[PDB]
């Protein structure tokens, strides 16, 4: 498996086409997508709700891609209030009728220019971290998920976490031969062993504080036991019974911070993967287990 890179790459900035203003931007997401979920977590952590709206698609990705709730009603899914789109593809096609890539989420939309600002989760969360600091209340303005002295270590972990873990699980799950499957899953678990020892005495990956590296990791790890273990055959061992440090870390984040918990919808997560990926799971059946979705704090 090879991930086709994102094609809308503009930034929100004081001095550009896309300036930081209240009620100008809008974020289209699925609760199921860990990429999109990065942007939801950071959006809450930075208290950006008044500047940035959110529309949640249905988790059931049929042949037309991600549907809006008026096409496919599902608990906690929304209709598109802006462009009245039926599927995420309409957003893309409206602004670029010749667009040749995947119709992905997250989509960061500009309500003023009627265009897509950025559809790359790593950039959305980066801009979310600073671009609105001047308009936000104190504590929210001060929060820095990418602080200067840690940017080197963050960039480092981000790159290999992205490669072997965030994308690793999908490389494992989408591989169509035994050899490609094994070539992906072994590094995945090697990297987990590494993260596991990194967290031996810590509550955060890097620097004793919350960073965007924890956010990027969390979205994968929280989906691991409920989905990746079975759905993507990433099953050498599990988080809850295989990785005490990762398990503690993930649970602290989940239970202790509404930004990680309120943006985490397990029904959307399990429905999306199991029901949509018929090339892996032909009858679209959603396993009941494991129970529970996530364990309480120790």
6 binds ligand GSH (CB under 6 A): yes
Of the candidates 69, 141, 143, 186, which one interacts with a copy of itself according to CB under 8 A?
A: 186
Q: Name residues contacting a copy of itself, limited to 109-128 (CB under 8 A).
A: none
Structure-token match 């995947």, residue found: 102
Total Cβ atoms within 10 A of residue 77 = 23
Ligand-binding site membership of 66 (annotated): yes
Minimum CB–partner distance for residue 4 and ligand GSH (Å): 8
Is residue 200 helix, strand or coil? coil
What does the DSSP 8-state code read for residue 105? S
Of the candidates 134, 137, 152, 285, which one interacts with a copy of itself according to CB under 8 A?
A: 285
Main-chain phi, psi angles of 142, to 5 degrees: -65, -30
Q: Name residues contacting ligand GSH, limited to 64-93 (CB under 6 A).
A: 65
Question: 108 has which bridge partners?
Answer: 27, 118
End-to-end CA distance of the chain: 37
Residues 6+ apart with CB under 8 A from 142: none
Helices (H), the chain: 34-45, 88-95, 121-128, 138-142, 151-161, 168-174, 178-198, 212-221, 229-231, 239-242, 244-256, 258-261, 266-276
The residue range among 116-124, 128-136, 186-194, 196-204 that interacts with ligand GSH, by the rule CB under 6 A, is: 116-124
Minimum CB–partner distance for residue 281 and a copy of itself (Å): 8
Of the candidates 12, 33, 184, 199, which one interacts with ligand GSH according to CB under 6 A?
A: 33
Residues for the chain: how many in total?
A: 298
Minimum CB–partner distance for residue 103 and ligand GSH (Å): 6
Decide which of ligand GSH, a copy of itself, none touches 289; Cβ closer than 5 to 8 Å per partner kind.
a copy of itself
35 binds ligand GSH (CB under 6 A): yes
Ligand-binding site membership of 3 (annotated): yes
Nearer to ligand GSH, 99 or 255 (CB): 99
| Tokens matching residue 52 | 């940035």
Minimum CB–partner distance for residue 76 and ligand GSH (Å): 17
The residue range among 101-109, 125-133, 137-145, 146-154 that interacts with ligand GSH, by the rule CB under 6 A, is: 101-109
Q: With contact defined as beta carbons under 8 Å apart, do 212 and 156 qualify?
A: no
Residues 6+ apart with CB under 8 A from 182: none
The residue range among 7-15, 68-76, 78-86, 97-105 that interacts with ligand GSH, by the rule CB under 6 A, is: 97-105
The residue range among 7-15, 114-122, 194-202, 243-251 that interacts with ligand GSH, by the rule CB under 6 A, is: 114-122
Is residue 33 part of the annotated active site? The answer reads yes
Residues 6+ apart with CB under 8 A from 197: 245
Catalytic residue among 33, 40, 188, 192: 33
Question: Can you tell me the distance from the alpha carbon of 212 to that of 210, in angstroms, rounded to the nearest whole number?
Answer: 7
Q: Name residues contacting a copy of itself, limited to 191-220 (CB under 8 A).
A: none
296 binds a copy of itself (CB under 8 A): no
Q: With contact defined as beta carbons under 8 Å apart, do 174 and 161 qualify?
A: no
Provide the binding-site residues for a copy of itself, judged by CB under 8 A. 175-178, 181-182, 185-186, 229-230, 233-238, 240-241, 279-280, 282-291
Q: Which residues are catalytic?
A: 33
Q: Which residues are annotated as a binding site for glutathione?
A: 3, 33, 66, 102, 105, 121
């Amino acid at each position: 498996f090879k991930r086709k890179a994102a094609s809308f790459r503009n930034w929100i900035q004081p001095n550009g086409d896309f300036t930081p203003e209240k009620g100008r931007y809008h974020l289209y997401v699925s609760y199921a997508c860990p990429w999109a979920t990065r942007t939801l977590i950071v959006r809450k952590l930075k208290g950006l709700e008044d500047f940035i709206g959110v529309t949640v698609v249905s988790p059931r990705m049929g042949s037309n891609g991600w549907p809006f709730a008026n096409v496919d009603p599902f608990p906690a899914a929304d209709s598109d209030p802006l462009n009245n789109a039926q599927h995420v593809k309409d957003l893309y096609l409206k602004v670029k009728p010749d667009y040749d890539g995947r119709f992905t989420v997250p989509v960061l939309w500009d309500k003023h220019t009627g265009t897509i600002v950025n559809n790359e989760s790593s950039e959305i969360i980066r801009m979310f971290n600073t671009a609105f600091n001047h308009l936000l209340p104190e504590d929210k303005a001060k929060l820095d998920l990418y602080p200067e002295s840690l940017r080197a270590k963050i960039d480092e972990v981000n790159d290999w976490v992205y490669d072997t873990v965030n994308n690793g699980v999908y490389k494992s799950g989408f591989a169509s031969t035994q050899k490609a499957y094994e070539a992906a899953v072994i590094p995945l678990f090697e990297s987990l062993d590494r993260l596991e020892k990194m967290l031996e005495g810590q509550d955060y990956l890097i620097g004793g504080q919350l960073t965007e590296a924890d956010i990027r990791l969390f979205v994968t790890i929280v989906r691991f036991d409920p989905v990746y273990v079975t759905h993507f055959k990433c099953n050498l061992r599990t988080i809850r019974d295989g990785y005490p440090n990762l398990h503690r870390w993930m649970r602290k984040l989940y239970w202790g911070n509404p930004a990680f918990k309120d943006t985490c919808n397990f029904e959307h997560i399990k429905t999306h993967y199991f029901w949509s990926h018929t090339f892996i799971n032909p009858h679209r059946i959603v396993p009941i287990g494991p129970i529970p979705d996530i364990l309480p704090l120790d």
